[PDB]
Amino acid sequence: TPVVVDIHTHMYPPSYIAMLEKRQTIPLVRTFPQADEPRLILLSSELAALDAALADPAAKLPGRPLSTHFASLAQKMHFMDTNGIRVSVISLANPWFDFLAPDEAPGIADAVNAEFSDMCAQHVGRLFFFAALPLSAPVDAVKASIERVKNLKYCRGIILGTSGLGKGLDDPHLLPVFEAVADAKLLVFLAPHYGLPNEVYGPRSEEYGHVLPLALGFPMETTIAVARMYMAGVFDHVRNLQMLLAHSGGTLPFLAGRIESCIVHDGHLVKTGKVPKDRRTIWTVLKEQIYLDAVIYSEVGLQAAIASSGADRLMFGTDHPFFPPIEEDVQGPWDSSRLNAQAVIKAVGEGSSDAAAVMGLNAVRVLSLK
């Protein structure tokens, strides 16, 4: 039944952008009279470059351009139509609602999630979404938000960053949140943003552009977050929890064997009763509660992911709009999308049932894509 579904694809909707425009501290959005697109500024490392451009506009324009590729639904549909994608499960891009004040967060999350539902309603059958949660608000407010979003048309899950309520995903206070999401039968899509402390990349990292934080920081962040969840016993505590991991689990398929060896050889864990004979291994969790996207750019990585979770638990994605062509027309086909489709072909063969599964039928099944 080969339909192509993209489960890793992002937007900033109008209500979100307008909210950021009203902000006076990071993250926030400024519209310069020189440029046709607003500027998104997240890190305080470039709020300074704003002041330069605000006074001496000869300086480089700060932050990221809030392009049509992030903000325009028509642009999203164009991307889909020109890259052979039938269905997208769209999600709010980083940094989501993580930075919002507790009192304002639930109301803003409501408006933004409402707008996502309405965007999906413009192209019935071709658009679904993962909702973001107001995780800076009290847990009761978070649980109320979950019960709300599960009743929004076209919502098929939750997108979650690695910070949780502020102390990461092994925070015990998140257990009722995971239970609420799991009982609502909402898939959790875990996505990176915070990366690693920039010092790890050394004094020359800027010479390499964004390669180190994007190529290494993001997948390593995802790995650490899920490893923490696993070690805390979250998957054992919430057995109906299902997680989709960005970028083929970051590095989890490659390090799963090492994680297992380190656990069974850890003196502290063994001697305090944390390594019982009946323990569910990370391999078991990878087959039973984890889905992996196929945003890995190589048959080498993809084969490791398939070996870890199985071909029925891998899902195609593009990470649109984060990797546009630098020299070819951005309104033409994107090689960053094509790279992963090619990885799928080389890994399991073109026209195979496994290819059809990874390219969309797994997503159709798991997310009940009407």
Place this chain on the structure above:
Amino acid sequence: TPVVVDIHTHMYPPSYIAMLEKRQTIPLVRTFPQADEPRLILLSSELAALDAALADPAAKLPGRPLSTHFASLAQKMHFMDTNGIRVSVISLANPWFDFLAPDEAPGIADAVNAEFSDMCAQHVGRLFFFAALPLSAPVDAVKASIERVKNLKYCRGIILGTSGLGKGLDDPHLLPVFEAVADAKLLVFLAPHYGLPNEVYGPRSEEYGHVLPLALGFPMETTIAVARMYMAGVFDHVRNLQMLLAHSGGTLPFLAGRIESCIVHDGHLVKTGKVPKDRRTIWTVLKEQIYLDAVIYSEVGLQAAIASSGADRLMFGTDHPFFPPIEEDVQGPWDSSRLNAQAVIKAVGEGSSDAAAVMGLNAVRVLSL
């Protein structure tokens, strides 16, 4: 049967321990009457507990035990004999000489490397070693040390941490060192130690023992270090440089595709001519200048490593003595060793030429054993 070679195996030799025993600041070693092993104190926090045991013989022993598994050559030979290993290429364990002052470092490195050669001489044909360098010293002193160790019997390469001279492996000042090691035809074994800043593991990390820093920190450190090397053009600048990466490249085989995609989609690099059409990709470097150890614990990881570098560039190792059995007899076979041997068998088949290659014949060829 073809030779089984272990290329990832560590020791703290007597001269190194004696040097650490004389130190008054981290890292240091101290012995006690109530302990049958010396104590390795590597962290600032442990100094509090040192004085407590230094005062009271009732209090808890500080640091971690310098066991026979680290310190005894007879113990190393016993491990080899009970885990089916014919040859070990031994190396000084972390923290090596990184902490030493520039003036004392070359003399200490000289003594330690000479002792490694002498240890190998006690079991001719079964022991070789990677030498450690005094990288806190001036580069001219480092180059002199390199020319010395290459002429020590049984030396077959260099072991290198990720800090380099103090600013990592993409430090321009380190280029003459890479050139010197490469021109001496010495393999560089890159090993982790510094991991990641502990804050990345969150407030509950101690509840998980050492799992997060060891399972994630070490391989991620290796990945970042080699990626920095690659982006800096070190492999292009030193075309005869050959490097063996600890723990199957950390995560490099899994992230190589992502690294490449991020490079070709980087505006800054593309617009500044750093992504020319004839650039040697990370895949090419993985096949031409990188060897990977097989210390990966699963056929899943091993298959990715083999796909990346080829079966002729994978080498078996044990990481002895870092993962002893917790309950099982430590003088019997080690699970941590057999896991990797089993991974090889499950990946390329027991008795195959690929298996014989990974289990030792690659090391025999590349290191001239």
